[PDB]
Amino acid sequence: PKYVEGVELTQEGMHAIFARMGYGDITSGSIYNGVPTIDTGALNRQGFMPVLTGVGPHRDSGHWIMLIKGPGNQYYLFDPLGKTSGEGYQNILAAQLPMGSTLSVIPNGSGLNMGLCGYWVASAGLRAHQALNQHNPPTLLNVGQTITNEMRNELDHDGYRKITGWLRAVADEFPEGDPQLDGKALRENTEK
Secondary structure, three states, X not given: OOOEEOOEEOHHHHHHHHHHHOOOOXXXXXXXXXXEEOOHHHHHHHOEEEEEEEEEOOEOOOEEEEEEEOOOXXXXXXXXXXXXXXXXXXXXXXXXXXXXXXXXXXOOOOOOOOOOHHHHHHHHHXXXXXXXXXXXXXXXXXXXXXXXXHHHXXXXXXXXXXXXXXXXXXXXXXXXXXXXXXXXXXXXXXXX
């Protein structure tokens, strides 16, 4: 399967889901043997960048997180495993951003990932992007709080089954066809 392996998005799958939602042909990032590949031009241009962390010679799969650009010289790190996990990548990622930039980790809660990091990056990651860049942005705390709550509410009522079933259904191609703001909307509008 090109887009999904087990219940995780491959790099091809991540590109494909952003293309299907209407974000065009995006550039993703990675951390290979502890060294980041981050195109800052594409980051600034996109407003965000999914980053496949934890990869290396013997590891194609890793842990997806989302790099977000805010207003000004502010950047954010969304980690579906929670605040501590993200703080794990904070430094190495921060040193890749423009001089004068700051990188803060979104303080969302642990225990809600369920092996769905790619899905979360493509949904909650985008919603965090949109929230932090709207006219009256919430505080970092409110954004973290809100993301935690949204992940928990989506996992309720057979959420894991619904998400994993959809991901398996779209393992090779996505259905048509309206564009969407985030992956949850795409899922709900293409079978869930």
